[model samples]
Target: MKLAPYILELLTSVNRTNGTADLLVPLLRELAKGRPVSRTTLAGILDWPAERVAAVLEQATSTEYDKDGNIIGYGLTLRETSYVFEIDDRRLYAWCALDTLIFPALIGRTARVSSHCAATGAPVSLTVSPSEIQAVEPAGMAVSLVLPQEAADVRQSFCCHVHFFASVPTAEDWASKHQGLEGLAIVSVHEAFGLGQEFNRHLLQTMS
Candidate 1:
């Protein structure tokens, strides 16, 4: 699922309550009453280790001591909020909450993509055009995929730009720990959509 600008901002916000920075978006979305979530529960979401969660929250709020040397509610002081990117390698398509979508397809053998306009009613076709496409590098990288701006025949509007990104914790980590960032739990886009799995499958199939 593509994250909205506000949701992304919230996830990366520095001023977020302890442990909220890493898990708040998932928590907030899961807390809604009517949504059917097959993924997680309030007690254990994200499949993270219990100790890890506690450690993160602890880091956010040091143990507060009382006059008698007893513990009280954790202390959280107001400070300047900051944010850090934790994940990347995502495909951000300009899709609406509704209908027909146009995705990329290779033209026999060329550095261009032929639009594969799939109707919600018909079978969808997808092809990978490698020459026209490039890896979304995590290193100071930014790329945009241009699509047909015209409205689809199925009465749905199309977005102009498809953005792909490889977000990271910092520019420094981009050069190292690159593989770990793409892990499913850390970087949601790849894991949630099985992009990496599909790519591997395709490559092996082509080789055979």
Candidate 2:
């Protein structure tokens, strides 16, 4: 929620979408759901007056230039989204998991692999909701992180886990549960993303 004053002004400006609170409200909640209310992506997603969105966030953050100067991307600060919070971007595999938000269709496969690796040898149920997918084409998906993946396959003291789909819960759900389980050790690579080059095709819009 630490946005620049300029950014807030732009969002509230007169030229922003005929003053319809209906149009803007969803954009605010959805864009800000588990993520930061990014100025640029808000404009892009809502097709709100681009100049306006830019102006508000810029003023709020106090940067001379627009979004490029302020944010490449933003998410809810870990304090809000993470339980333990000690697990910042420094841990071994956190970056790889965050990278999936940029290309989220890879998740179907990650579920397959994580279930395969679990100590319980159980079938991890998979579910996808409309919110989980942002856009897809010959490129890939732009998706929200902090999904609800099924945790039945995970076990206590050994690689405890939670699963998410875009629809079911907020990011805070998982963060609250596993905050205390430290010093326990296990390695779970979302094996689907690590599959060989052929796996890339699932994300491609065209066969060629």
Candidate 3:
């Protein structure tokens, strides 16, 4: 099935619409620099005033902060999650499997993603640049797909179930026992990235 709409719907449900994407896209770039971003710095980076930044952040799902109230994570986070996204010698993380797939393109950077299969412990790795998926190991590696009924806590609801698997069979096998997963499916790496690319572009359009 074409998955872009599901991705869009999930994001929209979390209040990550165009306005949120506008701020979030730039914030992600600063996070990629492997440093926590202060409110003022991120505001300056986006040419937005501090109040506007705070207002959007308060309403959005961008989760993370430092002791000084600096933003340490958005979608591509400094904190560890299910996926490890390495770039520029900085080992960062993503909120979900889809985050690892899509954020590199949104941030205009290259990343090497390392994560284990959800069903099996086998490693699944991939290299991605701003425009494309450069490579994927385990040639047959696939992504498990699902959307939760309620995604107010998108990570726990939706993202936690989405993951990389050694191959389609492994992804399907895992899904078979995991009942009640909304919109569940098994998808190939290239096709997953392609769907992510569309989502990336969709988010990008809101940045302006």
The 10-residue segment with the lowest total lDDT in model 3: 10-19
Q: Write the per-residue lDDT of candidate 2 for residues 149-187, one digit (tens) a residue.
A: 122111121212432222213223434454554321111
What overall lDDT goes with each candidate model?
0.26, 0.27, 0.79
Q: What does candidate 1's lDDT look like per residue over 90-145, in tens digits?
A: 21221211100111211022111112211111111222232223322232222121
What tens-digit string does per-residue lDDT give for candidate 3 at 6-76? 77775575444323667767788888899889989988888887788887777655469988888898778
Sorted on TM-score, highest at the top, how do the candidates line up?
A: 3, 2, 1
Weakest 10 consecutive residues, lDDT, candidate 1? 77-86
Model 1: residues with Cα > 4 Å off, grouped in runs: 1-19, 34-43, 60-208
Q: Which lDDT value does model 1 have at 185? A: 18
RMSD value for candidate 3? 2.2
> Which is better, 1 or 3, measured by TM-score?
3
Candidate 1 vs candidate 2: the lDDT winner is: 2
